[PDB]
Amino acid sequence: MTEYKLVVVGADGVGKSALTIQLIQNHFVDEYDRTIEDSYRKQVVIDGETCLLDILDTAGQEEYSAMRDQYMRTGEGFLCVFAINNTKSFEDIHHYREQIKRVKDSEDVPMVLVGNKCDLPSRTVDTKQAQDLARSYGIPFIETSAKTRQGVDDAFYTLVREIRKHKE
Ligand SMILES: Nc1nc2c(ncn2[C@@H]2O[C@H](COP(=O)(O)OP(=O)(O)O)[C@@H](O)[C@H]2O)c(=O)[nH]1
Ligand SMILES: [Mg+2]
Numbered sequence: 001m002t003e004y005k006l007v008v009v010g011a012d013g014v015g016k017s018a019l020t021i022q023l024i025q026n027h028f029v030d031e032y033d034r035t036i037e038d039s040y041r042k043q044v045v046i047d048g049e050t051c052l053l054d055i056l057d058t059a060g061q062e063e064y065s066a067m068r069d070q071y072m073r074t075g076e077g078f079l080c081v082f083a084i085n086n087t088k089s090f091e092d093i094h095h096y097r098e099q100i101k102r103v104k105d106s107e108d109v110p111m112v113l114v115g116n117k118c119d120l121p122s123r124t125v126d127t128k129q130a131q132d133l134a135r136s137y138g139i140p141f142i143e144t145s146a147k148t149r150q151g152v153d154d155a156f157y158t159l160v161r162e163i164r165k166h167k168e
Contacts, residue, residue, distance in 0.1 A: 001043070002051040004160045007071050009058050009096045010081035011089040015116040018146035019081065020057040023156050028147050035059050039067060046157045053156065072103045076166070077110035077159040083117040084143075087124045090115075090133075097137065110162035111139045114155045119145040 008016045017032040024040045037059035043052050056071040078100050082089040093113065100109050113134045115125060127143070134141035140158050144151035 002049065003054055004051055004077065004163055005054045005071060005075045006077050006079065006156065006159055007056045007058060007075040008079045008081065009060075009100070010079075010114075011086070011092040012060065014081045014083045014086065014089045015144075015146045016059075016079075016081055017057050019079075019114070019116060019144060019152060019155070020055055022146045022149055022152050023053075024055070026149070028149075035061050037061060037065065037068065039071070046160050051160070053160075055156075072100075077112070077163045079112055079114050079155060079159060081114040081116050081144075082125065082130075083120075084115045084125050084130075085117055085120045085122045090125045090130070093133065108166070110159060110166050111137065112155060112159045112162060113137070113139055113141045114144050114151075115141065116144045116146060118143045118150060119147045 008020055010016050012034055018029055020040055021029045024042050038057055040055045040057065041052060043050060080093055080096050082093055101107060113130060115130050130141050142151050142155045142158060144155050
């Protein structure tokens with residue numbers, strides 16, 4: 001049974017926890033403590049392959065965790081999430097990409113740029129901005145809404161496909 005070890009990163013409030021729970025539990029969580037970091041596991045079928053997902057929902061807290069360390073070290077792909085109504089969160093993305101490059105000592109890490117909250121009308125980052133940024137990195141860009149499930153499987157599955165390419 002293939003396992004994929006994914007990590008969800010991004011600024012506070014972008015929806016990292018909502019997207020992870022929406023994937024795992026198929027419901028949209030209104031409020032979830034911003035300082036809570038946890039791992040989730042679900043067996044799924046991606047493209048006809050049954051596999052295990054093992055997902056760390058980061059909170060970027062400073063107290064030490066040894067789980068945090070192993071997933072950064074052993075994690076195989078990363079979701080870099082910003083919100084489309086949050087210009088500062090899109091500006092924060094570079095910091096997170098550079099941190100992942102450092103942990104993997106590599107410019108080629110499986111990674112997907114996710115622009116969350118696409119159910120909102122007050123959009124300050126347009127698709128081209130985000131598409132230009134993902135092309136710069138050579139990684140996919142996927143629009144998500146944790147609230148209605150739009151793109152949620154696509155974001156997590158596309159990353160797994162990025163992991164598959166790397167493993168070849
Ligand atoms: N409208 C909308 N709100 C969202 C979406 N995802 C998350 N939120 C809301 O944004 C806030 C932060 O979400 P949370 O999952 O705690 O973000 P985190 O800090 O990245 O873990 C919460 O109030 C969520 O209800 C979304 O797709 N659409
Ligand atoms: Mg959270």
